[PDB]
């Protein structure tokens, strides 16, 4: 900590407070995360994350494990997608910039997924943007290293809006498909300027998904009915049209979105396949206003 002069609180992250800080010796401006907790397995896992380098992954600069405490030092980025969505809500983020952002995030996912590393907790607050038009994923890999709690150290409720249905149904093992689900949710929210599934409990989250995509059954999701938290008693809603769900989105975007939101994680499109989808045929990289 003392190697760093705290500039300001960015805010309270999943695992502890996050600060903009300056490296008092190198001049480097960084995001400093204190990890609220020791454990040798978290140490070796975090150490593996140091090598997982990609232009759309927030760079982990250093792990500081001193005085039985853990700090992570990241590349600093000045804005998150939530702030940027809020800032541009009168008109929406332009479609070419949505496409650029989705394309870059899928490249980041594809890279981490090829190394068997998952995010598990994608959300506008951990998608970070710069002035060169780049978008980057923050906190990749941390969930496996430390977990995902219900509440933060500060009692802020962790959001369920981007949680994949297999998680809500009590899947014990997560696949890369959970990140594709979240990213699809974020894609829809960029387009409509409304969260897709703003649940405020697990059942509310599940039943919001169900009311939009239809209650899943054995037809669309082989094995759904034997999942831990599946209840035969769930109401059986019918699916709605994507035309009604994400209106302005064109037929390519709707078609991609549909594949990122398949119930069965095995049927859900991979980041690699999604990058080849016709939706990206005219992708470009605009500069955002910021
Ligand atoms: N002003 S802002 O748009 O809210 C914003 C958002 C994000 C940052 N930077 C940030 C934030 C961050 O974690 C966030 C997660 C959500 C709670 C606040 C900390 N991790 C990071 N790694 C590199 N930059 N960085 C700075 C400002």
């Amino acid at each position: 900590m003392e190697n760093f002069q705290k500039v300001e609180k960015i805010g309270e992250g999943t695992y502890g407070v996050v600060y903009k800080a300056r490296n008092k010796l190198t001049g480097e401006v960084v995001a400093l995360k204190k990890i609220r907790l020791v454990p040798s397995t978290a140490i070796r896992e975090i150490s593996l994350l140091k090598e997982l380098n990609h232009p759309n992954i927030v760079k982990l600069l250093d792990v500081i494990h001193t005085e039985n405490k853990l700090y992570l030092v990241f590349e600093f980025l000045h804005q998150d997608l939530k702030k940027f969505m809020d800032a541009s809500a009168l008109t929406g983020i332009p479609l070419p910039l949505i496409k650029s952002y989705l394309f870059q995030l899928l490249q980041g996912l594809a890279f981490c997924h090829s190394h068997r590393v998952l995010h598990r907790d994608l959300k506008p607050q951990n998608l970070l943007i710069n002035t060169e038009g780049a978008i980057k994923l923050a906190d990749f890999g941390l969930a496996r290293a430390f977990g995902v709690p219900v509440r933060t150290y500060t009692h802020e409720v962790v959001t369920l809006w981007y949680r994949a249905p297999e998680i809500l149904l009590g899947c014990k093992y997560y696949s890369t498909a959970v990140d594709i689900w979240s990213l699809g949710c974020i894609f829809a929210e960029m387009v409509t300027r409304r969260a897709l599934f703003p649940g405020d409990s697990e059942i509310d989250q599940l039943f919001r998904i169900f009311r939009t995509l239809g209650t899943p059954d054995e037809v669309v999701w082989p094995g759904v009915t034997s999942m831990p938290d599946y209840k035969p008693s769930f109401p059986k809603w019918a699916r709605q049209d994507f035309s009604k769900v994400v209106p302005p989105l064109d037929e390519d975007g709707r078609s991609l979105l549909s594949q990122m939101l398949h119930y069965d994680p095995n049927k859900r499109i991979s980041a690699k396949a999604a990058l080849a989808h016709p939706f990206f045929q005219d992708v470009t990289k605009p500069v955002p206003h910021l």
Side-chain angles (χ1 to χ4, degrees), residues 1-23 25-35 38-290:
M1 153 125 336
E2 67 253 15
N3 315 85
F4 293 95
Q5 192 90 69
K6 281 178 202 132
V7 174
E8 49 163 7
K9 200 143 103 206
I10 302 178
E12 331 263 30
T14 312
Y15 313 103
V17 60
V18 183
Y19 283 95
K20 186 179 189 183
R22 189 156 0 230
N23 183 316
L25 322 136
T26 198
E28 221 164 3
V29 161
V30 303
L32 212 210
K33 304 186 178 211
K34 187 218 189 304
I35 300 303
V38 174
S40 89
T41 293
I43 291 298
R44 309 182 195 131
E45 197 82 273
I46 289 295
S47 294
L48 263 342
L49 293 178
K50 278 196 280 209
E51 315 299 346
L52 190 76
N53 295 134
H54 181 98
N56 305 110
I57 304 293
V58 179
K59 180 182 178 52
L60 171 59
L61 295 175
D62 257 308
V63 186
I64 304 179
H65 179 26
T66 55
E67 256 97 52
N68 295 91
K69 284 208 267 190
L70 198 54
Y71 300 83
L72 299 178
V73 184
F74 288 94
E75 186 195 359
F76 180 78
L77 275 86
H78 288 81
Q79 281 246 313
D80 68 40
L81 187 71
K82 184 213 187 103
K83 180 138 168 204
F84 182 70
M85 278 194 293
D86 289 345
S88 80
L90 251 47
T91 171
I93 303 176
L95 174 84
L97 187 56
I98 293 176
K99 188 174 301 193
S100 171
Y101 280 166
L102 183 58
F103 187 69
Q104 293 176 61
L105 296 175
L106 287 162
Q107 289 171 252
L109 285 198
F111 169 82
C112 297
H113 291 174
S114 68
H115 290 84
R116 317 260 35 180
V117 178
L118 345 180
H119 193 108
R120 223 207 93 135
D121 192 33
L122 297 177
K123 68 216 188 181
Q125 264 167 38
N126 62 34
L127 305 174
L128 308 184
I129 58 175
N130 64 23
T131 45
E132 339 293 355
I135 190 159
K136 312 195 188 194
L137 298 124
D139 293 357
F140 224 104
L142 298 196
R144 195 195 162 169
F146 314 124
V148 177
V150 205
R151 320 281 215 86
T152 71
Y153 91 98
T154 26
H155 321 281
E156 195 202 304
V157 169
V158 185
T159 304
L160 309 179
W161 306 354
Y162 313 94
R163 192 155 302 175
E166 62 268 34
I167 295 178
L168 300 152
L169 290 179
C171 78
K172 282 185 269 302
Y173 306 99
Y174 316 115
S175 83
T176 60
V178 313
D179 290 336
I180 294 301
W181 179 274
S182 301
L183 184 54
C185 284
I186 292 163
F187 175 27
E189 176 172 352
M190 281 194 290
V191 178
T192 61
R193 318 170 224 175
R194 224 180 147 128
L196 193 58
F197 304 124
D200 65 349
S201 70
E202 270 158 86
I203 206 56
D204 184 62
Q205 188 69 30
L206 213 45
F207 290 0
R208 282 173 177 273
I209 289 159
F210 290 0
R211 285 181 280 98
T212 295
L213 313 169
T215 297
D217 51 30
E218 294 287 327
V219 168
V220 297
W221 192 354
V224 71
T225 57
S226 23
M227 286 204 277
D229 301 307
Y230 177 76
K231 311 269 165 212
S233 55
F234 279 158
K236 294 138 286 298
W237 288 284
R239 177 185 201 91
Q240 284 312 294
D241 235 302
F242 276 48
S243 70
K244 178 203 191 38
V245 185
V246 290
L249 192 62
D250 65 51
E251 200 75 42
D252 287 318
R254 296 198 321 276
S255 161
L256 205 205
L257 183 64
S258 187
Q259 297 190 105
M260 302 176 74
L261 302 171
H262 275 140
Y263 265 118
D264 189 343
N266 301 98
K267 287 187 193 67
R268 203 168 303 148
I269 191 164
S270 67
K272 192 146 173 312
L275 284 167
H277 187 282
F279 184 66
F280 294 115
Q281 204 164 0
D282 63 353
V283 71
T284 65
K285 191 184 174 170
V287 349
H289 165 56
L290 293 215

